[PDB]
Amino acid sequence: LKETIISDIHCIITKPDRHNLITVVVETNEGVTGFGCATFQQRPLAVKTMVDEYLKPILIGKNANNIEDLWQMMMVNAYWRNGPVINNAISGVDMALWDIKAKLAGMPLHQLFGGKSRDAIPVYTHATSDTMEGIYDLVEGFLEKGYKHIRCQLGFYGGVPTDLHTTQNPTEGSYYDQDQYMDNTLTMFKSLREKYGNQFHILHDVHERLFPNQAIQFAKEVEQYKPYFIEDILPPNQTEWLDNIRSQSSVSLGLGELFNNPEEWKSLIANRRIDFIRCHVSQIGGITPALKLGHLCQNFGVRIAWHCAPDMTPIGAAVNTHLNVHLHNAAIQEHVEYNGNTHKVFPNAAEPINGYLYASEIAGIGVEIDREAAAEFPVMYRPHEWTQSRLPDGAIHTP
Amino acid sequence: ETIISDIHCIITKPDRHNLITVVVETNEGVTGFGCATFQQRPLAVKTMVDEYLKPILIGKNANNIEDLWQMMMVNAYWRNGPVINNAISGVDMALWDIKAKLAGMPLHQLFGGKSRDAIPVYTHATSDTMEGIYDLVEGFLEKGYKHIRCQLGFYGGVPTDLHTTQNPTEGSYYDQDQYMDNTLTMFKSLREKYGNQFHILHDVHERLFPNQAIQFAKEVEQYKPYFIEDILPPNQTEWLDNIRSQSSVSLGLGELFNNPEEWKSLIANRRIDFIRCHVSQIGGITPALKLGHLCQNFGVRIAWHCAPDMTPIGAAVNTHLNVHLHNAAIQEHVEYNGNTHKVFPNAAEPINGYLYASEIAGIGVEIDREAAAEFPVMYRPHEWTQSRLPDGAIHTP
Numbered sequence A: 001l002k003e004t005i006i007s008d009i010h011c012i013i014t015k016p017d018r019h020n021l022i023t024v025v026v027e028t029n030e031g032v033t034g035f036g037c038a039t040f041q042q043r044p045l046a047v048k049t050m051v052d053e054y055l056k057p058i059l060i061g062k063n064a065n066n067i068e069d070l071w072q073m074m075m076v077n078a079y080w081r082n083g084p085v086i087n088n089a090i091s092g093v094d095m096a097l098w099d100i101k102a103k104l105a106g107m108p109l110h111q112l113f114g115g116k117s118r119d120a121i122p123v124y125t126h127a128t129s130d131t132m133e134g135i136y137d138l139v140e141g142f143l144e145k146g147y148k149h150i151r152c153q154l155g156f157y158g159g160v161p162t163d164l165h166t167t168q169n170p171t172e173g174s175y176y177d178q179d180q181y182m183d184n185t186l187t188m189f190k191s192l193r194e195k196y197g198n199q200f201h202i203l204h205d206v207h208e209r210l211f212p213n214q215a216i217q218f219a220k221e222v223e224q225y226k227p228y229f230i231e232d233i234l235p236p237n238q239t240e241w242l243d244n245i246r247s248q249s250s251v252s253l254g255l256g257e258l259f260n261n262p263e264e265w266k267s268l269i270a271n272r273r274i275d276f277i278r279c280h281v282s283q284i285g286g287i288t289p290a291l292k293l294g295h296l297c298q299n300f301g302v303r304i305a306w307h308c309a310p311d312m313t314p315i316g317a318a319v320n321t322h323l324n325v326h327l328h329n330a331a332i333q334e335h336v337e338y339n340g341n342t343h344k345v346f347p348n349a350a351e352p353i354n355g356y357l358y359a360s361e362i363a364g365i366g367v368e369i370d371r372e373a374a375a376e377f378p379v380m381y382r383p384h385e386w387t388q389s390r391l392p393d394g395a396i397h398t399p
Numbered sequence B: 001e002t003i004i005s006d007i008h009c010i011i012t013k014p015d016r017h018n019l020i021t022v023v024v025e026t027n028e029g030v031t032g033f034g035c036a037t038f039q040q041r042p043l044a045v046k047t048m049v050d051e052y053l054k055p056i057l058i059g060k061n062a063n064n065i066e067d068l069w070q071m072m073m074v075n076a077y078w079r080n081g082p083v084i085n086n087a088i089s090g091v092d093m094a095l096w097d098i099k100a101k102l103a104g105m106p107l108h109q110l111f112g113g114k115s116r117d118a119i120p121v122y123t124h125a126t127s128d129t130m131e132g133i134y135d136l137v138e139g140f141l142e143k144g145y146k147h148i149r150c151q152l153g154f155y156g157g158v159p160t161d162l163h164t165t166q167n168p169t170e171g172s173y174y175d176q177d178q179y180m181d182n183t184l185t186m187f188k189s190l191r192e193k194y195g196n197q198f199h200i201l202h203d204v205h206e207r208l209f210p211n212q213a214i215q216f217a218k219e220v221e222q223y224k225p226y227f228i229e230d231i232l233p234p235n236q237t238e239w240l241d242n243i244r245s246q247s248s249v250s251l252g253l254g255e256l257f258n259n260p261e262e263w264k265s266l267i268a269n270r271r272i273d274f275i276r277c278h279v280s281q282i283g284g285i286t287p288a289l290k291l292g293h294l295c296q297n298f299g300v301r302i303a304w305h306c307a308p309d310m311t312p313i314g315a316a317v318n319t320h321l322n323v324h325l326h327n328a329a330i331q332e333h334v335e336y337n338g339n340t341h342k343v344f345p346n347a348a349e350p351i352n353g354y355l356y357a358s359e360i361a362g363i364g365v366e367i368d369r370e371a372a373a374e375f376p377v378m379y380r381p382h383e384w385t386q387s388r389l390p391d392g393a394i395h396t397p
């Protein structure tokens, strides 16, 4: 191996399905090209500005081989640090550098790490509908495909305030009622267990919809249905309340897709407050920190379920599968089938087979972006009205 | 209702620093100004304001600052961090400016008025020699300052003078042991010469590993610093327990904070004496009031970070916060140069070691948009942030 000099950096935003996806491309003098995921779907222009105007100038000319040095350097380069815009931009670079390294090594990404500790990673997918029969329809399709884990949600939560006990002139927003949401969810679980028994593991995402007193009540009530995990039962700033849950419920908990600061997860993990870490890999700054966090979780007996919803490139998905077949404490990979457009922008994107995702076996990450093809689906402004989530009295709640 | 009619985000560089101002316009003729300054990444903040905050603010009622703050903070789902928070801060401060203007009151009067007459100020004396420090100190004492942050030596640049490797990686190098030794010599020398004539502050600037920090804290204690600042990086503050158990040294920390999880345990466990957050990096006035109150409960005082790379609008806001919040302690000095005074008129300067809050309606300082246009954004690399130890490793800068 000789020095590998960075020659150019690109940042591409594309929207082949419903979400703005962000890819970073790192070119080298040596003609070895790396690809990485930088997807912060809600603010893609801010991530692209970050890469183009700020990371590019500090990276051109540097030796790509020293990923660790470059990561440490990038993370503190703006002085102020740790956030979703900065970390996503860095992730795109970090993943691309790992891609370049694996290509130079002539190895699949996970082989650099130390290779496999499992044959493939199990997958769970999403069944959400306003009717139980909609859920049943989705569930039965997934079971036919060999899925053994399904995240189920009954009802949609966020609409006009008129349906609720609201005030005389409600502030504009996406309204919901926490009690209605909990009641529907418990009914859903009961119905699913009566209908399917233990045919599949049921997951559910509380999505920080609750106050702490509601969260603990919900944990106790849902316990009997033995969810594989209940996800984001609290927002990231009230996880200290997990202690009271852990002292009286055996419910399995996943949390962390929101994290972009180590102080959000350090005490959480050291105190065993969760069972599955859920971080979005690009939010914490890429592969480099994901390995370390995986190892931290291993020490404390916490398993890994990285956030892998559709708001991420198939490049990012492939990276997570490499991480997932390598880290011994990886548990499961979230997945939603890719549409035709996405498959076209990112060739060779793996889909699950009989409920398992297999890591790519060519050199590198295994998935790149077709640039000229990404341009057909340009960045789209989206209001994301659901993030203006309000309770009946009109107050914002964490969405 | 005060309906928001437009939002602007102006980057201007009258001095060394790309400063960022948010302007909120209204149909009530009233105009608000706020600071969104993240100097190292200004275009990212501007993108955030222009493309993302503006559409969720136009047509909304500016009176309800608290709602708008809560709404903005979670609007991108992912949250916290310097880019989003600074954008939000610019808006938040401008909404406060509008409210104060409509009330016909200085900002601090909205909050509940003064709990001190003015806020003391600390200045900066950095030199390569003790004599250089003495000269600076004496000039400050003559002007009525009683608190001075002192630093002996400059720490960065070429590693030729250090015990480095054969072919050092490009970067701004320093040696932690030389830095600690120089700082201790500085404290000793200042106390020998001036005794208790003035309070001495020093900013460790996260230069140390935890084991070094603990040792330094114990050694420097005898010199009674007013505070030692950023003795640890924001991800190693658990190590403050080690220090707090065996040293009486006064500690300030937090200019780097942008996430409440960074300060919550720290404050509830009394691990610092002065909170140092930069108001715009935590999201503006709205969260600064709450954080100030949180500290008050726990017996922690306030020394918000102030620097030339914050608009004078931001400075004025801090002085309003400082004369109002009972647990405020001291305001870091920012000697603004002439161009900056031109672009941001009526900026207060210390008088006999004190900063007095503005007494006109509003924040009291605005941006002159024509003046600002004379100094467009200019790229800067900030090479100092690539800080390295003699073996070539990055250290938090």
Ligand SMILES: O=C(O)[C@@H](O)[C@H](O)[C@H](O)CO
Residues within 6 Å of the ligand: A205, A207, A257, A307, A308, A309, A310, A311, B077
């Ligand atoms: O676990 C999940 O897939 C969800 O929490 C989504 O990521 C969230 O609605 C933002 O897209």
Ligand SMILES: O=C(O)[C@@H](O)[C@H](O)[C@H](O)CO
Residues within 6 Å of the ligand: A079, B203, B205, B255, B305, B306, B307
């Ligand atoms: O406390 C201070 O004024 C310094 O730590 C500055 O924030 C830092 O050098 C970046 O400009």
Ligand SMILES: [Mg+2]
Residues within 6 Å of the ligand: A205, A207, A231, A232, A257
């Ligand atoms: Mg989720």
Ligand SMILES: [Mg+2]
Residues within 6 Å of the ligand: B203, B205, B229, B230, B255
């Ligand atoms: Mg400082």
